[PDB]
């Protein structure tokens, strides 16, 4: 990319990267065993965020030295944030897949129910002050890309809640990202229905969308509406997809009365989630097509599980990334 970390960081106090977890860590994260069993190129790093006063864990797939400096992909988890079991590391072969591609991949393992944005208000249930856009865009790239010896190219990818984030970041900082991948989300956030979809994610973290982006339709909410500001994506290589499934983000790939009742619910909820995302994606495509902004589209049918589609999204988005990075 032509825009450097220092170009977007400006005044911002930068992150400090450590190769070891804080000594005050009480218990080992669930994902640590997965890192420890993967190739030596998969590393656990920790980035201190000055704005949040938080140590953020990162699962990093490092490139080999056979071709020198390589690009970096910032891959975001959904609502889980990497703080539970419903994430890239624990539900997909993300580590093995990218190891073979020879590319740097950085997966933050904190940020549950945050939309990876800068929140207007604090929320103790989510760690207090949330400044994930400042962290991911301004605090982290400079020191981390230096440590990884990247070639100066970068991409942002997100799924579900962070499939809004991966469209907002390149719009907020045009030219910073070479590519952006949005894996099954809703670009719109200020319209009636899209605002209510923010509540599905935020209710799980004891939060409201007003704490995050202020009043619906307000200045900051519109700034964070990726459908309204879709034209600002021009210049970025894009990959937009669908992870339509019955068993969603919560599900990994007793009596027959309760086994059939619970199964009836996933078909219904997965169906409402699929329908909601399908329209959001259709509106974005119509808006980008009308503006002459090209994207790689992976609109898929209803699958058995959403995580099966999300693992397939790592493959699908590789065509966008290989093209944007000239690999
Ligand atoms: O779709 C908009 C509404 O989404 C949430 O509520 C729905 O989902 C809950 C959990 O499955 C149900 O209990 C509830 O009946 C649904 O309406 C959100 O909590 C609402 O505020 C939104 O209007
Ligand atoms: C992620 O696809 C999804 C929210 C997408 C926005 C369109 C509805 C999430 O799984 C659904 C809510 C489950 C609780 C986190
Ligand atoms: Cl250290
Ligand atoms: Cl901490
Ligand atoms: Cl494969
Ligand atoms: Cl609070």
XYZ file of C-alpha atoms and ligand atoms in Angstrom:
369
model
C 0.000 0.000 0.000
C 1.002 3.602 -0.661
C -0.233 4.795 2.773
C 2.132 3.848 5.592
C 1.429 3.086 9.268
C 2.943 6.506 10.232
C 0.679 8.265 7.698
C -2.500 7.022 9.446
C -1.131 6.992 13.062
C -0.246 10.690 13.224
C -0.047 11.820 16.869
C -1.165 8.385 18.334
C 1.000 6.717 21.011
C 2.172 3.429 19.457
C 1.760 -0.145 20.739
C 4.571 -2.131 22.376
C 4.820 -5.730 21.166
C 5.933 -8.468 23.596
C 6.737 -12.118 22.775
C 5.298 -13.380 26.069
C 1.964 -13.095 27.917
C 1.659 -10.776 30.985
C 2.989 -12.400 34.181
C -0.348 -11.552 35.842
C -2.164 -13.975 33.455
C -4.277 -16.203 35.732
C -5.275 -19.026 33.308
C -4.135 -20.101 29.832
C -6.386 -19.059 26.928
C -8.180 -21.914 25.121
C -6.338 -21.146 21.883
C -2.813 -21.498 23.358
C -2.738 -25.312 22.852
C -3.601 -24.789 19.149
C -0.699 -22.322 18.759
C 1.699 -24.682 20.614
C 0.806 -27.633 18.325
C 1.211 -25.590 15.088
C 4.473 -24.947 13.110
C 7.151 -22.754 14.768
C 6.099 -19.962 12.377
C 2.827 -19.621 14.361
C 3.509 -17.335 17.304
C 1.705 -15.866 20.271
C 2.410 -12.119 20.599
C 0.996 -9.454 22.914
C 0.399 -5.819 22.002
C -0.074 -3.153 24.644
C -2.722 -0.585 23.675
C -2.043 2.826 25.256
C -5.592 4.156 24.550
C -7.309 1.176 26.161
C -4.501 0.440 28.749
C -4.958 -3.184 27.638
C -2.668 -6.037 26.686
C -4.170 -7.534 23.547
C -3.245 -11.125 22.575
C -2.439 -11.796 18.894
C -2.101 -15.172 17.093
C 0.420 -14.503 14.326
C 1.204 -16.739 11.341
C 4.654 -15.541 10.201
C 5.952 -15.816 6.634
C 9.134 -17.785 5.863
C 12.334 -16.056 4.621
C 12.499 -17.775 1.177
C 11.124 -14.607 -0.471
C 12.046 -11.866 2.046
C 9.405 -9.307 3.146
C 5.808 -10.522 2.711
C 2.361 -8.835 3.052
C 0.247 -8.926 6.222
C -3.440 -9.817 6.589
C -5.267 -8.539 9.681
C -7.953 -11.249 10.162
C -10.722 -10.422 12.617
C -12.926 -12.811 14.592
C -16.675 -12.214 14.869
C -18.637 -11.545 18.063
C -16.543 -14.072 19.983
C -13.493 -11.840 19.474
C -11.179 -14.818 20.019
C -12.168 -14.806 23.724
C -14.076 -18.122 23.557
C -14.400 -21.164 21.304
C -16.290 -19.627 18.323
C -13.249 -18.217 16.458
C -10.916 -18.775 13.457
C -8.230 -20.619 15.472
C -10.592 -23.029 17.214
C -13.097 -23.650 14.381
C -11.013 -23.636 11.153
C -7.623 -24.761 9.685
C -6.577 -21.059 9.401
C -3.057 -21.825 10.705
C -2.206 -24.650 8.264
C -3.833 -22.912 5.290
C -1.870 -19.621 5.573
C 1.413 -21.330 6.582
C 1.504 -22.831 3.050
C 0.715 -19.441 1.410
C 3.836 -17.739 2.874
C 2.084 -14.607 4.150
C 1.905 -12.864 7.533
C -1.530 -13.200 9.225
C -2.384 -11.413 12.472
C -5.468 -12.508 14.412
C -6.360 -10.436 17.491
C -7.744 -12.753 20.215
C -9.679 -10.137 22.203
C -12.483 -7.763 21.254
C -15.683 -9.729 21.901
C -18.972 -7.969 20.956
C -17.000 -4.764 20.074
C -17.490 -4.381 16.310
C -13.692 -3.585 16.512
C -14.562 0.119 16.597
C -13.863 3.157 18.871
C -16.751 3.319 21.340
C -18.376 6.584 22.439
C -18.889 5.178 26.014
C -17.112 2.727 28.309
C -18.628 -0.693 29.161
C -17.133 -2.617 32.111
C -18.546 -5.951 30.826
C -16.275 -5.555 27.747
C -13.166 -4.286 29.606
C -13.963 -0.589 29.937
C -12.617 1.744 27.268
C -12.844 0.333 23.749
C -10.678 1.913 21.060
C -10.240 -0.994 18.638
C -10.083 1.151 15.506
C -7.318 3.308 17.086
C -5.546 0.124 18.160
C -5.856 -1.847 14.892
C -5.258 1.064 12.529
C -2.999 3.464 14.443
C -1.307 1.779 17.453
C -0.550 -1.691 16.086
C 0.574 -1.579 12.372
C 3.794 0.464 12.823
C 5.527 -1.610 15.498
C 4.015 -4.972 14.459
C 4.799 -4.704 10.726
C 8.354 -3.648 11.661
C 8.725 -6.752 13.907
C 7.325 -8.987 11.130
C 9.471 -7.339 8.402
C 6.455 -6.919 6.098
C 6.795 -5.715 2.501
C 4.517 -2.722 3.238
C 1.405 -4.391 1.777
C -1.638 -5.134 3.939
C -5.258 -6.354 3.922
C -8.160 -6.392 6.417
C -10.634 -9.308 6.696
C -13.556 -9.870 9.039
C -16.530 -12.167 9.595
C -20.028 -11.561 10.889
C -19.783 -8.495 13.229
C -16.258 -7.688 11.917
C -17.469 -8.016 8.284
C -18.822 -4.432 8.952
C -15.353 -3.461 10.363
C -13.446 -4.760 7.283
C -15.526 -2.434 5.063
C -15.383 0.585 7.470
C -11.588 0.576 7.977
C -10.669 1.078 4.243
C -13.401 3.743 3.932
C -12.062 5.627 7.002
C -8.415 5.360 5.817
C -8.441 5.231 2.013
C -5.323 3.644 0.513
C -4.099 2.096 3.821
C -5.340 -1.391 2.876
C -4.555 -3.027 -0.461
C -7.504 -5.410 -0.026
C -10.559 -5.864 2.203
C -12.616 -9.046 2.737
C -16.108 -8.940 4.305
C -17.246 -12.490 5.216
C -21.047 -12.541 5.749
C -22.045 -9.280 7.438
C -24.159 -6.156 7.112
C -22.487 -3.028 5.711
C -25.476 -0.836 6.669
C -25.636 0.097 10.373
C -27.813 3.257 10.595
C -30.981 2.074 8.845
C -33.914 0.651 10.886
C -33.253 -3.078 10.455
C -29.398 -2.858 10.355
C -29.381 -0.935 13.672
C -31.426 -3.751 15.233
C -28.837 -6.305 13.977
C -26.188 -4.417 16.041
C -28.373 -5.309 19.096
C -28.094 -9.115 18.351
C -24.299 -8.896 18.844
C -24.155 -6.180 21.522
C -26.873 -7.659 23.778
C -24.524 -10.648 24.380
C -21.891 -8.265 25.802
C -24.433 -6.385 28.007
C -24.157 -3.380 25.702
C -26.313 -1.132 23.497
C -25.429 0.333 20.057
C -25.871 3.870 21.524
C -22.879 3.169 23.859
C -20.845 2.203 20.780
C -21.793 4.781 18.053
C -24.199 7.234 19.672
C -27.775 7.944 18.593
C -29.109 6.080 15.533
C -28.738 8.267 12.437
C -26.315 10.564 14.292
C -23.034 11.831 12.824
C -20.841 9.051 14.256
C -23.329 6.296 13.327
C -23.419 7.478 9.666
C -19.582 7.657 9.641
C -19.761 3.961 10.697
C -22.353 2.935 8.069
C -20.454 1.061 5.352
C -23.408 1.039 2.914
C -23.889 4.850 2.949
C -20.119 5.380 2.527
C -19.580 2.476 0.070
C -18.152 4.757 -2.627
C -15.084 5.390 -0.371
C -14.013 1.752 -1.001
C -12.940 2.737 -4.602
C -9.300 1.734 -5.073
C -9.391 -1.230 -2.670
C -9.479 -4.824 -3.965
C -12.660 -6.334 -2.451
C -14.020 -9.760 -1.549
C -17.592 -9.891 -0.241
C -19.239 -13.228 0.639
C -22.186 -15.160 2.279
C -21.902 -17.790 5.035
C -25.632 -18.762 4.840
C -26.144 -21.664 7.218
C -28.594 -23.193 9.694
C -26.063 -23.678 12.550
C -24.283 -20.357 12.848
C -21.321 -18.652 14.525
C -22.126 -20.288 17.906
C -21.952 -23.861 16.480
C -18.899 -25.992 15.578
C -18.799 -28.178 12.458
C -30.995 -35.976 25.303
C -34.716 -36.832 24.423
C -35.706 -36.850 20.718
C -38.428 -34.226 21.581
C -35.843 -31.677 22.831
C -33.310 -32.684 20.107
C -35.956 -31.845 17.456
C -37.145 -28.652 19.273
C -33.569 -27.244 19.480
C -32.931 -28.255 15.824
C -36.118 -26.440 14.726
C -34.749 -23.266 16.361
C -31.424 -23.346 14.518
C -33.234 -23.729 11.152
C -35.407 -20.672 12.081
C -32.603 -18.414 13.598
C -30.052 -19.345 10.927
C -32.781 -18.610 8.384
C -33.491 -15.143 9.870
C -29.718 -14.433 10.045
C -29.224 -15.605 6.444
C -32.166 -13.496 5.180
C -30.857 -10.363 7.011
C -27.267 -10.757 5.620
C -28.575 -11.601 2.119
C -30.370 -8.262 1.816
C -27.451 -6.312 3.323
C -25.109 -7.889 0.768
C -27.577 -7.313 -2.084
C -27.838 -3.608 -1.161
C -24.046 -3.260 -1.053
C -23.608 -5.008 -4.417
C -26.258 -2.849 -6.080
C -24.581 0.305 -4.649
C -21.026 -0.747 -5.642
C -22.209 -1.939 -9.100
C -24.008 1.392 -9.718
C -20.768 3.221 -8.773
C -18.549 1.006 -10.978
C -16.576 -0.383 -8.002
C -15.560 -4.013 -8.573
C -15.487 -6.773 -5.957
C -15.087 -10.547 -5.951
C -18.513 -11.940 -4.944
C -18.968 -15.280 -3.218
C -22.688 -15.390 -2.722
C -23.398 -18.930 -1.525
C -26.480 -21.080 -0.866
C -27.731 -22.262 2.558
C -25.092 -24.596 3.956
C -25.358 -26.918 6.934
C -22.959 -24.797 9.049
C -21.762 -21.214 8.799
C -18.202 -22.187 9.910
C -17.886 -24.488 6.902
C -18.472 -21.479 4.666
C -16.119 -19.275 6.713
C -13.266 -21.772 6.309
C -14.042 -21.798 2.534
C -13.902 -17.896 2.684
C -10.194 -18.139 3.524
C -9.783 -19.962 0.168
C -12.175 -17.662 -1.749
C -10.550 -14.465 -0.463
C -7.103 -15.763 -1.469
C -7.794 -14.915 -5.115
C -8.472 -11.281 -4.039
C -5.375 -11.193 -1.775
C -2.983 -12.825 -4.282
C -4.133 -10.233 -6.897
C -3.910 -7.208 -4.542
C -0.474 -8.312 -3.276
C 0.903 -9.364 -6.705
C 1.916 -12.814 -5.381
O -34.138 -8.420 14.688
C -34.198 -7.255 15.516
C -34.234 -7.558 17.004
O -33.073 -8.376 17.303
C -32.947 -8.783 18.687
O -34.088 -9.609 19.218
C -34.483 -10.821 18.634
O -33.631 -11.912 19.035
C -33.765 -12.330 20.419
C -32.775 -13.463 20.627
O -32.914 -14.519 19.665
C -35.237 -12.712 20.691
O -35.392 -12.991 22.082
C -36.184 -11.573 20.307
O -37.549 -11.969 20.461
C -35.958 -11.128 18.873
O -36.775 -10.014 18.520
C -32.863 -7.584 19.612
O -32.732 -8.012 20.965
C -34.046 -6.657 19.374
O -33.873 -5.475 20.159
C -34.187 -6.303 17.891
O -35.389 -5.565 17.688
C -22.678 -12.725 11.996
O -22.991 -13.222 10.696
C -24.070 -12.470 12.661
C -24.431 -10.948 12.551
C -24.519 -10.496 11.066
C -25.371 -9.250 10.797
C -26.570 -9.573 9.895
C -27.707 -10.132 10.746
C -24.246 -13.175 14.067
O -23.852 -14.524 13.920
C -25.730 -13.241 14.478
C -26.014 -12.928 15.958
C -25.594 -14.050 16.932
C -25.105 -13.511 18.289
C -23.653 -13.028 18.246
Cl 8.983 -10.188 25.973
Cl -4.369 -6.614 30.796
Cl -7.087 -26.042 0.530
Cl -20.157 -0.085 32.737
